[PDB]
Design a protein around this ligand. Structure first.
Ligand SMILES: [Mg+2]
Ligand SMILES: [Mg+2]
Ligand SMILES: [Mg+2]
Ligand SMILES: [Mg+2]
Ligand SMILES: [Mg+2]
Ligand SMILES: [Mg+2]
Ligand SMILES: [Mg+2]
Ligand SMILES: [Mg+2]
Length: 1306
RNA sequence: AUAACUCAAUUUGUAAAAAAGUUUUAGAGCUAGAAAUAGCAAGUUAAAAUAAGGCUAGUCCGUUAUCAACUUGAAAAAGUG
DNA sequence: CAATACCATTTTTTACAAATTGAGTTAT
DNA sequence: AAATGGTATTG
């Protein structure tokens, strides 16, 4: 009887029900409630609308940040508990004053000066120590006994802001010997190159290298002090290495292979090992010198002070910042006095200007302040202040955005210094030095997670003992090993074939043997003599493995031929059938280990298999080297200490697909052979793992054969689309219920298809490329949003097809070409797009860029690939012409993929639907598919609309969502009716190329009468009518023109953050929300703008006047998210606390956002809040006006446009009727009318597009601004909810077919 | 359509960390002059909170998912035209 | 009252697993 | 990254 059409989107699910003749039924539905209507007729077409589903990301960030805050607090508490007793003797209430420092004097228990308790001592303190860093340095360097409170302040300041943990081990600053070290590097280099020596030259290496410029700049200056020495040269590269940069050494050493070294990267020792093996170890001392120079210079950006003077170079550098700020401030003030005293007031007094006053007291940033005074500085006569400005070193504060560079090791250094200094005077500091250091030091390992005790959904850590966990007892109380193990294993896949078995490490030796053999097994070969291509035998395979795979990292086909087939079988020439260029599989771990253990015979020994598998397992499972070592301790007797040291560092990540038991555990009953045995040797049939697993003769297969919401949430994809999936399932259920619990014949489903990342991509790709184009043409992140500019930079300001430069001022003349033409592949991304001055230079139009273009441009594309400026996909598409380009079969494939859905998520949807609809099995125990789920791509219905002029304009209303579903149902049912053999492609469940091409390219022709075709379209085998050109189109037009369509906005309780996060200053307003229980916002300030979880109808009585008369009230109260739980626990008490009395509890109506209300003339409003409403109506514009608008915005149709210009006036008339009846924004409507009146002279096209603009005035939901032409219309908002309180509440089903209407008269 | 491998791009989810920002308080402003109001002097730092808070009391948890109305359920969801 | 203009926490690092897309080899 | 509901201020 009926089929269902569905359109699944991120914010919408369109739905429709059709009959055998493509009609949508109209049914009478019962209306519940206290209203007049007992029923309403509804057409069975509509669309569900809903706010986007959100990722769990923001929540994760908030949660983790929370944990950070509490843990920092705990650090401070530990510190205070250590200091407690000895502080009690010095100061009774010090810590108390510290914790109540936020309180106003009126609220304080103790006196207002935190540190010392009186004015004189406090002022004295601040006079002696203007910044905390002054106190830090003094406490580090001095020898005098210090006040315990000052000591605490220093220690606490270092602990509260400890710095990062990105560098392992410890640092011990030594800026002292940079000159001697640089001279030493130059020395050893000159030794190694006796022929040509570099002159030390009195080059102030210290100044240039520790200067506050970027690494690269300092390099340039350094080699600028060097004659005949280029930055790309050997020594230049070495200097770059010492600077913490990543240089490449291959061009210096004639190496074909890349040799890039970065001292910070953990692979440095090994990369350098390989380089030295390639070039000779007489170059080792050179790199040693580079490293030695690197250590003394490592933290030059941070320290800025000679390490001789102090043991606190950081705090000293901060003190420097302070002093320079001071001096330059005195100077600047003096200057402005002398030369521009008129602007002095704006600079040093006005907080709102971005001056120095706005800088210090206002919310102006260092950048904004700098930008403010740049012109002031340069216009005056000041020359050095600009230098400081360009250095970003003008008037610096100590607490800045760029202090994230600071590693915890330096704060640790100062901490330890202070501790050593004052432990001489305070014994408890001596006894507790290690604890305190460990407070700053300790960090919960990421592989351990939250230190929970059975109440954290997120935690996995296991306890070695039942103590409360502290930083000092962590190793003893927490089972770190089992915790890391859990960290990885709670996420890792189990073998699907053997669900109880863990998957092997990807770099497992066994797994790679399995992969290499699984690949080798299907390799065939032919020679001149033999009569057919032959498999490799067991013997031959072991030969190839032992000789090639166990000697060469990768094994090429050429190596197979020459090194095996030629050398061992005396074949001068041979053909290979199973492998391409080189074997994909490789025994990489075998060679890694071989480099480490140095004992091939140990590896080849079968008895060491378990041990090796355990070692690789340990290497994969853990990455904490300290634990890896402990894991390997058993095998310490097997190899030397150096070998163990090397084995620690070898680390693997990733897990395979299969288990050890599958590969080498299960044995075939008849054979007694494992899978791997069959891969090694299977005689005549060289059977695959796939074959092995499905072979009825073998016993492997049989040995193996041993909630909707959860299911949807478990799928892979955006949560936004998952929301749509759940919604569409529920819609289907309700539709089936509507149709008397009869299942549909068919269900047709369709599914819908920055700047910082771009700037990063370009910066890296260019730096790697070595291009100056960023320096020549500076960009900003928001400029790259332009496609042509982004491309331009991705191609290094070059033509992609022609090997010539492009112009940044001529992009409008240039073309964006699709690499594989749009007709075949609907790809709009950068992976398929290219900037060239003209697309003709691509070559042919019907294909991949031509062979000439490939030949001429290939290497450039290689460079772009290596700089990551183009991906591999893009490259391989660019270069396809040297593989014959696009084959006709590929063309056909692209065409059928244009209309046949391959997306996995949609297949999941189709499967969910199919499994819900078909639940019965026949007498043969096979599924009875009563309902056919059909999946269509958007192109079918889009093309159908264009061809037969069923035009779509999204902005008019939300009806198009439903219309698309209707057309989906129609077109789908028609398609399967006409071509039942196509069931395999479009329906869920279980020469020629040109033919396929034409076929799929012309599949939708049966709808047309002339392209000639009969008026009636029927299916040959059954003769059943599929289409009737004489009436079915008319029916479609009737359906699309149907005025009433069930568009339902999903009512939703608002969730998430309580309010805006901003912490506002104190203000006299009841809107201000306390940040803490005792913190009155009139005194302390706080939060603002809370989010309404849901409104609530209250009818009750409230006091009025001094005498507290009981007046009667009916009103909407917004229950905020923060208030929610309290309101649910006991609503009566909550409402009574709000000031309501005699609350009629039974009349309480929960009103979530988007609640629907009908009023006077069909006029509707949706609940936006407790104090604002949204538009609740859909403007049903006649199809003539929609089609006319489509044609006018974008020859017979042109003359149709010119013939029907009166349609504009009729459309605006429609809009006006609508607005006056429903929108009620007279002023805005008058501005619309006026604006249209002024622009009647303008071209019809423009006027039409701008008429399209006019519809947001009439659109459903939140009011929004729009421009008619140059006239901007501000939104008319609905700032009151009074009328709704006497309106009619409409409770809607998911389809909106069932309604309960409540006349809110009470 | 499925399975393993290779190369790459992407998406989702989790953990451990860092630097700012903000808000109050503390950094005795000063001479004049009744008084606003002038003139100058100043400014870089710190403490504390950073979802209100919760019981399960852990160096744990608090912003995702899910939600018509009536009847039933704890809850999912069911039962109703 | 309701017309109106302004506002909205930001940024960084490390470690990890799973899908999926889509170009290839081999198979059910 | 909008955009759209809160807020103070004005009209
Ligand atoms: Mg659609
Ligand atoms: Mg807290
Ligand atoms: Mg600050
Ligand atoms: Mg290959
Ligand atoms: Mg590992
Ligand atoms: Mg939610
Ligand atoms: Mg701060
Ligand atoms: Mg509803």
């Amino acid at each position: 009887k009926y089929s269902i059409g569905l359109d699944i989107g991120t914010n919408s699910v369109g739905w429709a029900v059709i009959t055998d003749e493509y009609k949508v039924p109209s049914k009478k539905f019962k209306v519940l409630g206290n209203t007049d209507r007992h029923s309403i007729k509804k057409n069975l077409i509509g669309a569900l609308l809903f706010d986007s589903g959100e990722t769990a990301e923001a929540t994760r960030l908030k949660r983790t940040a929370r944990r950070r805050y509490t843990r920092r607090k705990n650090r401070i508490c530990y510190l205070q508990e250590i200091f407690s007793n000895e502080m009690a003797k010095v100061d009774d209430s010090f810590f108390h004053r510290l914790e109540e420092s936020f309180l106003v004097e009126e609220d304080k228990k103790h006196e207002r000066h935190p540190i010392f308790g009186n004015i004189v001592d406090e002022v004295a303190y601040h006079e002696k120590y203007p910044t905390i860093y002054h106190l830090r340095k003094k406490l580090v360097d001095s020898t005098d006994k210090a006040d315990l409170r000052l000591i605490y302040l220093a220690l606490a300041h270092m602990i509260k802001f400890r710095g990062h943990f990105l560098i392992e081990g410890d640092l011990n600053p030594d800026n002292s010997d940079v000159d001697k070290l640089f001279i030493q590097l130059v020395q050893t280099y000159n030794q190694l190159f006796e022929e040509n020596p570099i002159n030390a030259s009195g080059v102030d290496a210290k100044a240039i290298l520790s200067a506050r410029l970027s690494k690269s700049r300092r390099l340039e200056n350094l080699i600028a002090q060097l004659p005949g020495e280029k930055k790309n040269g050997l020594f230049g590269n070495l200097i770059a290495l010492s600077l913490g940069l990543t240089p490449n050494f291959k061009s210096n050493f004639d190496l074909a292979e890349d040799a890039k070294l970065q001292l910070s990267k953990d692979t440095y020792d090994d990369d350098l090992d390989n380089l030295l093996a390639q070039i000779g170890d007489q170059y080792a001392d050179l790199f040693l010198a580079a490293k030695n120079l690197s250590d003394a210079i490592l933290l030059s950006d941070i320290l800025r002070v000679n390490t001789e003077i102090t043991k606190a170079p950081l705090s000293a550098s901060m003190i420097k910042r302070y002093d320079e700020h001071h001096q330059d401030l005195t100077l600047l003030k003096a200057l402005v006095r002398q030369q521009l005293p008129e602007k002095y007031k704006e600079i040093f007094f006005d907080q709102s200007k971005n001056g120095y006053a706005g800088y210090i007291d206002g919310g102006a940033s260092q950048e904004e302040f700098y930008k403010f005074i740049k012109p002031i500085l340069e216009k005056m006569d000041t020359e050095e202040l600009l230098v400081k400005l360009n250095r970003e070193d003008l008037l610096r504060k100590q607490r800045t955005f760029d202090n994230g560079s600071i590693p915890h090791q330096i704060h640790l250094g100062e901490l330890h210094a202070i501790l050593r200094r004052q432990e001489d005077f305070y014994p408890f500091l001596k006894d507790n030095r290690e604890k305190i250091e460990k407070i700053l030091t300790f960090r919960i390992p990421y592989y351990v997670g939250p230190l929970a005790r059975g109440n954290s959904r997120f935690a996995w850590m296991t306890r070695k003992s039942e103590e409360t966990i502290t930083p000092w007892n962590f190793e003893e109380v927490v089972d770190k090993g089992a915790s890391a193990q859990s960290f990885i294993e709670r996420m890792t896949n189990f073998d699907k074939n053997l669900p109880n078995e863990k998957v092997l490490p990807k770099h497992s030796l066994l797994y790679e043997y399995f992969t290499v053999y699984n690949e080798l097994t299907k390799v065939k070969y032919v020679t001149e003599g033999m009569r057919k291509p032959a498999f490799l035998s067991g013997e031959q395979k072991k030969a190839i493995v032992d000789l090639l795979f166990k000697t060469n990292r990768k094994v090429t086909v050429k190596q197979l031929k020459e090194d095996y087939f030629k050398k061992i079988e005396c074949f001068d020439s041979v053909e290979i059938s199973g492998v391409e260029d080189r074997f994909n599989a490789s025994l990489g771990t075998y060679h890694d280990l071989l480099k480490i253990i140095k004992d091939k015979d140990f590896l080849d020994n079968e008895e060491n298999e378990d041990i090796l598998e355990d070692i690789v397992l340990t290497l994969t499972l853990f990455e904490d080297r300290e634990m890896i070592e402990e894991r390997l301790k058993t095998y310490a007797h097997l190899f030397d200490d150096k070998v163990m040291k090397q084995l620690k560092r070898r680390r693997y990540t990733g897990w395979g697909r299969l288990s050890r038991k599958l590969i080498n555990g299960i044995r075939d009953k008849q054979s007694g052979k494992t899978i791997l045995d069959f891969l090694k040797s299977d005689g005549f049939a060289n059977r695959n793992f796939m074959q092995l697993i499905h072979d009825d003769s073998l016993t492997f297969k049989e040995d193996i054969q041993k909630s909707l919401h959860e299911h949807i949430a478990n799928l892979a994809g955006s949560p936004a689309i998952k929301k749509g999936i759940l919604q569409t399932v529920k819609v289907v259920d309700e539709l089936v219920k509507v149709m008397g619990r009869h299942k549909p014949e068919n269900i047709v489903i369709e599914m819908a298809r920055n700047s910082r990342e771009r700037m990063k991509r370009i910066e890296e790709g260019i730096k790697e490329l070595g291009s100056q184009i960023l320096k020549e043409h500076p960009v900003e992140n928001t400029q790259l949003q332009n496609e042509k500019l982004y491309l331009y930079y991705l191609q290094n300001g070059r033509d992609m097809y022609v090997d010539q430069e492009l112009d940044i001022n001529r992009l409008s003349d240039y073309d964006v070409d699709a690499i594989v033409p749009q007709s075949f592949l609907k790809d709009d991304s950068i992976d398929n797009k290219v900037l060239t001055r003209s697309d003709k230079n691509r070559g042919k139009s019907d294909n991949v860029p031509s062979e000439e273009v490939v030949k001429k441009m290939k290497n450039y594309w290689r460079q772009l690939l290596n700089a990551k400026l183009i991906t591999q996909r893009k490259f391989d598409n660019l270069t396809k012409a040297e593989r014959g380009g696009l084959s006709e079969l590929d063309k056909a494939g692209f065409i059928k993929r244009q209309l046949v859905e391959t997306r996995q998520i949609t297949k999941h949807v189709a499967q969910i639907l199919d499994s819900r609809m078909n639940t019965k099995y026949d007498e043969n125990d096979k599924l009875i598919r009563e309902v056919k789920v059909i999946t269509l791509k958007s192109k079918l219905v889009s093309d159908f609309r264009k061809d037969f002029q069923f035009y779509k304009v999204r902005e008019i209303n939300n009806y198009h969502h439903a219309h698309d579903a209707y057309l989906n149902a129609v077109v789908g049912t028609a398609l399967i009716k006409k071509y039942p053999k196509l069931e395999s492609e479009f329906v869920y469940g279980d020469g020629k190329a040109t033919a396929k091409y034409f076929f799929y390219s012309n599949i939708m022709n049966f709808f047309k009468t002339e392209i000639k075709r009969p008026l009636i379209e029927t299916n040959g085998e059954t003769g059943e009518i599929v289409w009737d050109k004489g009436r079915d189109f008319a029916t479609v037009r009737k359906v699309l023109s149907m005025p009433q369509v069930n568009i339902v906005k999903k009512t939703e309780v608002q969730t998430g953050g309580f309010s805006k996060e901003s912490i506002l200053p104190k203000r006299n307003s009841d809107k201000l929300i306390a940040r803490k229980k005792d913190w009155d916002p009139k005194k302390y300030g706080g939060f603002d703008s809370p989010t309404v979880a849901y409104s609530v109808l209250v009818v009750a009585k409230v006091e009025k006047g001094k005498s507290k008369k009981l007046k009667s009230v009916k009103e909407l109260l917004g229950i905020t998210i923060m208030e929610r739980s309290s309101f649910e626990k006991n609503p009566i008490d909550f409402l009574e606390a709000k000031g309501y009395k005699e609350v009629k509890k039974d009349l309480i109506i929960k009103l979530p956002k988007y609640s629907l209300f009908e009023l006077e003339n069909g006029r509707k409003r949706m609940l936006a809040s407790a104090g604002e409403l949204q538009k609740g109506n859909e403007l049903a514009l006649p199809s003539k006006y929609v089609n006319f608008l489509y044609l006018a915005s974008h020859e017979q149709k042109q003359l149709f446009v010119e013939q029907h210009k009166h349609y504009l006036d009729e459309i605006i008339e429609q809009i006006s009727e609508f607005s006056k009846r429903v929108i009620l924004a007279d002023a805005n409507l008058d501005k619309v009318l006026s604006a249209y009146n002024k622009h009647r002279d303008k071209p019809i096209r423009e006027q039409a597009e701008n008429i399209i603009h006019l519809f947001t005035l009439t659109n459903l939901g939140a009011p929004a601004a729009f421009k008619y032409f140059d006239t901007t219309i501000d939104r008319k908002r609905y700032t009151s909810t009074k009328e709704v309180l006497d309106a009619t509440l409409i409770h809607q089903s998911i389809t909106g077919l069932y309604e309960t209407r409540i006349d809110l008269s009470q």
